[PDB]
Design a protein around this ligand. Sequence first.
Ligand code: HEM
Ligand code: HEM
Ligand code: HNI
Ligand code: HNI
Ligand SMILES: O=P(O)(O)O[C@H]1[C@H](OP(=O)(O)O)[C@@H](OP(=O)(O)O)[C@H](OP(=O)(O)O)[C@@H](OP(=O)(O)O)[C@H]1OP(=O)(O)O
Lengths: 141, 141, 146, 146
Amino acid sequence: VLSPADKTNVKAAWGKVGAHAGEYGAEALERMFLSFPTTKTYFPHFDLSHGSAQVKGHGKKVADALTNAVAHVDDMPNALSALSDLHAHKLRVDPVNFKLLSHCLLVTLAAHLPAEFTPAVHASLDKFLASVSTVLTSKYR
Amino acid sequence: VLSPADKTNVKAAWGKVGAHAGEYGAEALERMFLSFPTTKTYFPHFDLSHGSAQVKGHGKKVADALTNAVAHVDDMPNALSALSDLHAHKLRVDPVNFKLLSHCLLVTLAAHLPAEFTPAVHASLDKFLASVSTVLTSKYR
Amino acid sequence: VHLTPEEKSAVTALWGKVNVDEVGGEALGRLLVVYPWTQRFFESFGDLSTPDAVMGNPKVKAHGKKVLGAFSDGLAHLDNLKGTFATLSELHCDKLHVDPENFRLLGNVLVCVLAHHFGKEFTPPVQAAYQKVVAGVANALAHKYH
Amino acid sequence: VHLTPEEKSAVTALWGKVNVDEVGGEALGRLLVVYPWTQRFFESFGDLSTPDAVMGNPKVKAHGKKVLGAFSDGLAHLDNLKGTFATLSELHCDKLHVDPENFRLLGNVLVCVLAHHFGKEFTPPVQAAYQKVVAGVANALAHKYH
Ligand code: HEM
Ligand code: HEM
Ligand code: HNI
Ligand code: HNI
Ligand SMILES: O=P(O)(O)O[C@H]1[C@H](OP(=O)(O)O)[C@@H](OP(=O)(O)O)[C@H](OP(=O)(O)O)[C@@H](OP(=O)(O)O)[C@H]1OP(=O)(O)O
């Protein structure tokens, strides 16, 4: 359950991501494709090379979708209802990949929020990424 | 989430497990320790030899909690609340192990219900063991 | 992988009684029913909308037979699952883009299907030897991904 | 495992700037705070109630420094992780009973703590070299379970 400390810690670290989310989204994607290269069978149609405008443009959508879930932390199953329908019915990405993106998102925030990524913000961020994965995976069956 | 027809399939199939619930619970356990031996780091103080009375008595605690979760399948977190509290605050069993017991549970039922283990009743029972495992690991953090 | 040979002849005796034409189609059938997001690689196959359609769908039964005939080839090269599957591993990666976590999911539906089909004859130690083969094939077939 | 001779110079050059004693404590700490069921092994350890109780405990600190000292040896032999840790594998198995799935969870908390630490130096190809190293050390340590 996202406790009220968690929501404050996730709104505090995400606020500080800031106008840089789009950027941090793309660097997560990139880190995922190099560290877990099965995660690349989902983007066969992409230019997945460094600095691709396709990876930077998918970075911006993943990142906006997280901004909207942090903004309605209080009501995720409803803010994220079109993307759980998309995920569950067109994309049908295997659930394990949600773990591998949240880990490469958690390493991109750590890398860029030295001062903000405290043990407790990390637990808060790892808890919130696991509820967003649970909600985008809810209607798989 | 358990659709009505899932509820009907779960209840039919646990319907003829009926009084062998205990004996199949001991046998899922016994397949689990032999197929996945890492799960035995959890049962240090047991005898896990073939036919141990402690495997057979813990199969019966386990199938009876499943029986109880079948009968209260429209409100399993209150029906299982104290079992979430023991998993969460004492047993503290890594979440991937629920997945390994569900599959041994499904291989035991598959093997003892030739007629009732249909694709359809196989799909509802696996949705039903993923819902009891989500509820027992709810409160881990 | 290595099976002790008490494991190896466990797997091998049982598999001589299989119907690769019918466990074929049931394993690939029940994968597409129990884990419906796997239907994304098979939409070309038709009507996959209820369980009874998926199981009645003859392209599903046909390709299951083809999945399970290749499976039987590595049950004969158990020493070497990687060189035996290097080619389909490349092929599922590069021409089919199949997430190798599906190979684990078919793995475990095939063990439910062999329990179903052999009843009590699919004992805790034959399962345990067959969980070691289906991790070996899933592994062998993930082998050539990049 | 198979680290290209470029992935090993990457791992080796980041690890000779690491203070072992201090990254040790921040990784065990953060294991215990971010995956709090892992505290089922550390009852003898004292105040583990809040993040800063876990992070100031000098027992938690201490054993982090013992864990990372042995991981640090693992790094002098990337070409035989299994015989360099099969003695701790056999010990966490049979005497400590740790589910080897906790070695993935600490491995992924140490990739987060070296990022946190190195910042923009911990690049996507240096993350990818260390993911293969903490996977090799987790397999190595899981090796003698049974
Ligand atoms: C034990 C694992 C498996 C084995 C041994 C296996 C074997 C095969 C074989 C022999 C073919 C045909 C090669 C050819 O036609 O030239 C094939 C094709 C294919 N496999 Fe797999 N496979 C396995 C698992 C999977 C999984 C689980 C998926 C997807 C969820 C998958 C998706 C496909 C698809 C999409 C095709 C092509 C269907 C088509 O041609 O229209 N396979 N596989
Ligand atoms: C890279 C992963 C790991 C390495 C290299 C490592 C290494 C060590 C070392 C060298 C010791 C002391 C053994 C001795 O006294 O001879 C130790 C003790 C222990 N480890 Fe691990 N370990 C790892 C992961 C884990 C994890 C993830 C846990 C569980 C959360 C764990 C639980 C323990 C416990 C409970 C002790 C006992 C402390 C004592 O005897 O005082 N270890 N580990
Ligand atoms: C490894 C695969 C994978 C994962 C784990 C993943 C995880 C996530 C998460 C994680 C918490 C979020 C918020 C997210 C958000 C999105 N994904 Ni994901 N996606 C993934 C692969 C995709 C793919 C593939 C698409 C299609 C992109 C395209 O444009 O074709 C996609 C599309 C989207 C879209 C855009 C669709 C549109 O056009 O309207 C959003 C938003 N996503 N994805
Ligand atoms: C592999 C480890 C493991 C798994 C996955 C697991 C999964 C499950 C599942 C999920 C479907 C159920 C319903 C279940 C039910 C129970 N477990 Ni589990 N348990 C596990 C290890 C235990 C252990 C350990 C205990 C304590 C047993 C004992 O006798 O000390 C336990 C205790 C219980 C009890 C006993 C309550 C009591 O003694 O007060 C029940 C009932 N369970 N366990
Ligand atoms: O196929 P596996 O059973 O996984 O074994 C092979 C390899 O030997 P083979 O390639 O000859 O089979 C080694 O296994 P061991 O003899 O050490 O047990 C080990 O490779 P390293 O020497 O590089 O450690 C590694 O096994 P694992 O990753 O399970 O530790 C794995 O090598 P590949 O994954 O490169 O095939």
